Design a protein around this ligand. Sequence first.
Ligand SMILES: C[C@@H](NC(=O)Cc1c(Cl)ccc(NCC(F)(F)c2cccc[n+]2[O-])[n+]1[O-])c1cccc(Cl)c1
Lengths: 11, 276
Amino acid sequence: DFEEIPEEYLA
Amino acid sequence: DCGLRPLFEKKSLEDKTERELLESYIIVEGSDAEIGMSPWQVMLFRKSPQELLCGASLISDRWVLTAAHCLLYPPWDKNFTENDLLVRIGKHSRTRYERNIEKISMLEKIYIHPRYNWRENLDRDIALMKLKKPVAFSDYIHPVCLPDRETAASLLQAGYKGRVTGWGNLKEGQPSVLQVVNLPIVERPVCKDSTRIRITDNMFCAGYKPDEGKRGDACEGDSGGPFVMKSPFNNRWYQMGIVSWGEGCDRDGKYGFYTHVFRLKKWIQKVIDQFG
Ligand SMILES: C[C@@H](NC(=O)Cc1c(Cl)ccc(NCC(F)(F)c2cccc[n+]2[O-])[n+]1[O-])c1cccc(Cl)c1
């Protein structure tokens, strides 16, 4: 149940 | 400038429970932390699946301290590498993305104590994480201090209270925001007599005794988080321990065990001045 974080960090 | 919180010490404002700690110098059953109360609090976030991995602390603009078992623990098939995790600094809410407040950083390298004992009793449960790029400090992001020999000797005494923070479970369900609890350090003999696990000089335990009434303890998810104390000498916060292990959460007669930060500072210094 975690809010999606920016893709900039995931990539 | 370590251990001086922008929203408290820097403005000469006190949080609502630090007095309890000072009066003693002579997360289950905790409470919501105040904004900017633990600016060194770090959340270890797992990429896939996105979930709470562990707690940690900011000790510099590029270094994060945590428990070795948060990254490496064969019994539970845990062996995380750099790209498996992310570091979220300046957080308060557990699950939400705090836009304009928290800062997410990627890990460059992980360093686990070479003599970390995961096979038996989590002896030397400590690890360092170097961030790819420096994190900018702010009202919600600030490093905690590491204890020197004197600080440890004068503050690490039975009865003296420390503070543990984390987004871990509320019972042995999950908190909305960062939780905080103040707990007294316990006498070595009592710690030893409370468990079958072999205790070492690289750990200390804390928590209330059954006859003391009050309670509190860390729990799943709090691992790696900081056990801090506010020095009555220079009014700076020092991280004396790292949430390490326990049997159940907040059980009567049981106590949480923390990695003795000062005892392993030699290793910390070695890693920092050699790699960072
Ligand atoms: C978050 C939680 N920490 C853990 O779950 C870490 C952890 C791991 Cl990785 C393995 C076994 C245990 N506890 C059971 C134990 F037998 F004791 C124990 C301690 C050491 C090594 C093996 N075993 O088997 N704990 O507690 C914790 C809960 C409550 C208080 C604190 Cl300080 C910390």
